[model samples]
Target chain A: ASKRALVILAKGAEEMETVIPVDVIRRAGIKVTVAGLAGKDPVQCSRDVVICPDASLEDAKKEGPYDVVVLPGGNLGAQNLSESAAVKEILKEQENRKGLIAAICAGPTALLAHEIGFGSKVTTHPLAKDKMMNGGHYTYSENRVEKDGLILTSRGPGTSFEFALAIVEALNGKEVAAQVKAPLVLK
Target chain B: ASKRALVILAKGAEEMETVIPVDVIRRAGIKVTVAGLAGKDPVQCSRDVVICPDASLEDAKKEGPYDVVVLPGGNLGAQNLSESAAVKEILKEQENRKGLIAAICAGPTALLAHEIGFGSKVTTHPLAKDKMMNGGHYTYSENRVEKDGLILTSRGPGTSFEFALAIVEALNGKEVAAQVKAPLVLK
Candidate 1:
């Protein structure tokens, strides 16, 4: 059976982080859903890239039990995610089920905001460190990609490929991840 | 004066390759315009990522003389570029003006299609090599990113960061490129 992944697309999301994971995970034969946080309309990204989501989050939530829920970061995107009541519910559900919840850059701050993964060793873009460390809820690592059990976190755009590959290894296996990585010509 | 870039977005383009350059180049303070090849409608990309272009190519051409023009690749996307008389004209003008013209993955095939930079050492994704080398018009290299004069080419999604940084370096200098790179957390 194919594993299913859900990517919550919020306004001001980091387009690179959003697309890389979606593309690479699909390469690993996982069924990935790019769900729009704000209805089914095209979401404007941090750098002004507009992406039309596969479905609205309101609709996607009905199709639950995704293996992993991904959050891509842009300051504003993370802010939007951190502020959403629906996002809080989704992260909490994923956490309660002990499923994978991955985030990158400012995306990790949303985890902090939602109080989903306290005490996990996580990482975020250096600029976002101050916020992710607010109240010292989670230990921070400078590693490009950090996965402490169910919660996986990564830094910025530069680490997106690594961050995505990490998710693939978690969902599938090392072999499937390696197979997918080789074709993309990763360093 | 700010450097301006024109990214020609066509249906089936690789979303990663397209967005990475647009975002990174903009980070380097380059004015980037993502123009749609098929009017102002949003383009559906190769992995089903739909991207809304900033403007139509026809409208963008009229506002010409850009410092650099970029092409992002997917097999179908490059074919669209190859089939466009507008793309041919854009490349010819950029080549004649000695402005930077960058392509990646299957994108270099369009350079061949339009007869744009003959005798330049170039490269494409390994899978695209045979087609790009069909007529022996240009020399091929296996480097992740290749630059022979003003014609820059790179491999697939994995090399998009390097490719985008190279463009930033070319237009904005190494200092600006490095400044932009540090936040990205690249290896």
Candidate 2:
């Protein structure tokens, strides 16, 4: 069966962080769902790029048992994720299932909020570091992309491609990830 | 006056290419209008990401005299751009006005489709090189981001940040571009 990934999209999400991973994962032949946390309506991103989600998080959750759950970051978007009961349940379930949980930039802060995967090595945008380290639940790493067991984290929009490729390597394997990486012209 | 950019969005466009440049340019404080080539609607990208355009190209053209016109690349999206008479006229007018024209991946083929900016050195995705080099109408380089006079082009999704930053530097100067680049956490 093909690996399935869910990307939770919220208003004020960083469009680049949201799109890059989704695009790259699709390129790797992973089945990806970009679900709107707000609703099925078009989401207004941090930079004002509006994206229509594949489905509402409510609807998408029913289709899951996803192999991975991806969280993209923007200050407000992460806050929304951090505050959502639905997101909290999803993260908790994924952790209990031992499925991958990936977050980037401020996205990692949501992990802290949900109280999932404490003691994992994580990284976030420099500005978001203090928030992610608040209670020191997770050990911090400055790596562009860090993986500790099932929890994967990366820095900012600039690290999105690397973060995504890391997910690809995790789900698909090194060869498939390398194949998808070449055409992208990444250094 | 603020610099303004017109990003032409078409169905099957590479969503990563389209959104990255728009988001990054907006970070530079440029006024950016994402105009749909087909209409003022959500256009489905190559990977099926749906993006809602800010306006229709017809309406946006009326408001333009833009500082830069950006073309993002997806094979079919570039084909749609290559086939549009409206796109032809826009590229021609921008050229006649000596405004900057930027393209990425398959996008530069639209330049060939419209016969704009001959003799300038440009680059395209490796897969797009054959089509773009078809008639010797322009010189080709292997540079990740290529800029010759008022024409700028970049390789693929991996180079999107570089492509966008070049557009920012062209319109807003190096200082503003550098400031914008810092927040992205790009290497």
Candidate 3:
């Protein structure tokens, strides 16, 4: 069966973090939906890159039961994710279902806000550490990418490739991940 | 003095290559204008990421004489760039002015088509080597990121950070590039 991924796109999201994962995960033969956190309108990112999402989160949620739900981090974007009751419901359901929930940069803050994954070892952009550790509910790591069970997290933009490749590995297989990685000309 | 960059965005462009340079260059405080080669409409990238450019190439050209002009690649995107007379004029003008012209992945193929930077040392995605060397107008290196005077080129999505950072170092000083690199958490 083909795996499906839902990437939440929000205003002020880090475009690099968002696009890298969507592009890489799609390369791994997974079906990816870039869902706008607000509406289906074009999103202006942290660096002012505008991305038009595949669909609105409202519409995308109806498609249901994605294998992985990805959250990309920019301070304002994560704050938007953390504040959405709809996002809270989705994260909570994904957690209870044990589906993989991956976040990068300040994205993990949403997991903290939703109280989805307590005790999972996670990594966030170094600047986001204090916010991620605010509740002391999740153990934080300094790894570029960290996977503690179903909760997968990674650091900043520089770690996006690693973060996305790890998602490919988790969803498809190591072989698929390696195949996708080679053409990227990664060091 | 502040630096300015022009990134040509075409349909089927590699989203990672496009966004990385724009984001990273802006981080170094260089103003970047993502110009739509076709028009001022949103572009659907190689992996299906849609990016809305700041303005049409025709409109952006009026702002003229940018410090750097960047070309990002997807096979189809490069072909589009290669075929455009507008693109040819821009590259030729930039070359004549001896401004920085950066291309990545198959992007350097456009330089080949437009006959810009003949004899300049450059690199492209390994897959593009044959096309780039059709007449041996330029020397090709396998470096992840390669720079020769005003012409800068790089390999693939995986090398975008190095490529962007290299651009930053060129336009801004090494200190600014290093300052920007620290928070990116690049290994």
Clash pairs, model 3 backbone = none
Off by over 4 Å in 3: none
Q: Number of clashing pairs, model 1?
A: 0
lDDT of 1 by residue, B138-179 (tens): 999999999999999999999999999999999988999899
lDDT, candidate 2, B36-88, per-residue tens = 99999899999999999999999999998999999999999999999999999
Query: What are the Cα lDDT values of the candidates?
Result: 0.94, 0.97, 0.96
Q: Provide per-model DockQ scores.
A: 0.83, 0.92, 0.95
Error of 3 at B125 (Å): 0.4
Mind giving the per-residue lDDT tens digits that candidate 3 earns over A132-180?
A: 9996998889999999989999999999999999999998989999999
- Provide fnat values for all models in the order shown: 0.74, 0.88, 0.93
TM-scores, in order shown?
0.98, 0.99, 0.99
TM-score, cand. 1: 0.98
Give one digit per residue, the lDDT tens place, for model 1 in A73-123: 999999999999999999999999989999999999999899989999999
Which docking class does model 1 fall in?
A: high
